[PDB]
Amino acid sequence: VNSFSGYLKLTDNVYIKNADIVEEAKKVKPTVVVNAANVYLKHGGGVAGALNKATNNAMQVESDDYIATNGPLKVGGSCVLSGHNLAKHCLHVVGPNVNKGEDIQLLKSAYENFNQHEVLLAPLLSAGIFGADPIHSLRVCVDTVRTNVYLAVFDKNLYDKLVSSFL
Ligand SMILES: C[C@H](O)[C@@H](C)Nc1ncnc2[nH]ccc12
Ligand SMILES: [Cl-]
C-alpha cells in the first residue's frame, strides 16, 4: 500500500492520472520523481522547467555541478540526484526529443531506467515539448516498465484520449 490517490489502473503495475506532477510530488513526496531531462540537465521548460521552478532553482544548481563533474548524459540514459522539496530522489531520464531528430527507438531504453526503482511518480517520456506521440509513449511505458509507475498527465484533454484509446 502507498499514498498515491485517484489513479486509474492500466495494468498490474502501470497507473495513470490527470494531474500536475509538481503538485502531485509536493502532496505525495514520493521516493522517486522522474524528470523529463535533456542531456545537459538544463531544466528550462516543460516538466523539467516546472520541477526546477518548484525547487527554487536548487535542482538546476545541483545539476550544473553534476554536469561539470560528469559531462552530459546519454539520450536514453539517466542519473539519480536529489528530489529537493519534492521527493527523496529525482531520477533525471532523457527520452529522445523528436524536435531534435533523435531516434524514437531510444524511448524504450529511456523507460528501462525506471526498472531500477520499485515505485516512481513520472510523466510520459518524450511527450510534450519533446515531440513524441504520447499514445506511443504510454504504450512503450506499459511494455517496458515492470516496477510500479504512477503516470501524471497534466493536460486533461490528453488524459482522456490515452485512457479511451488504451489497449
Ligand atoms: C506528455 C507531457 O510530458 C506532459 C504530460 N507534461 C507534464 N506532465 C505532468 N506534469 C507536468 N507539469 C508541467 C508539464 C507536465
Ligand atoms: Cl511538456
Curated annotation (Swiss-Prot):
Protein role: Responsible for the cleavages located at the N-terminus of the replicase polyprotein. Participates together with nsp4 in the assembly of virally-induced cytoplasmic double-membrane vesicles necessary for viral replication. Antagonizes innate immune induction of type I interferon by blocking the phosphorylation, dimerization and subsequent nuclear translocation of host IRF3. Also prevents host NF-kappa-B signaling. In addition, PL-PRO possesses a deubiquitinating/deISGylating activity and processes both 'Lys-48'- and 'Lys-63'-linked polyubiquitin chains from cellular substrates.
Result of changing residue 31 to A: In strain: Mu/B.1.621
Membrane topology value: Multi-pass membrane protein
Regulation: Inhibited in vitro by GRL-0617.
Catalytic activity line of the entry: Thiol-dependent hydrolysis of ester, thioester, amide, peptide and isopeptide bonds formed by the C-terminal Gly of ubiquitin (a 76-residue protein attached to proteins as an intracellular targeting signal)
Consequence of substituting residue 164 to L: In strain: Gamma/P.1
Species classification: Viruses, Riboviria, Orthornavirae, Pisuviricota, Pisoniviricetes
Domain of life: Viruses
Organism: Severe acute respiratory syndrome coronavirus 2
Designated name of the protein: Papain-like protease nsp3
Compartments where found: Host endoplasmic reticulum membrane
Start and end residues of each Macro domain: 1-167
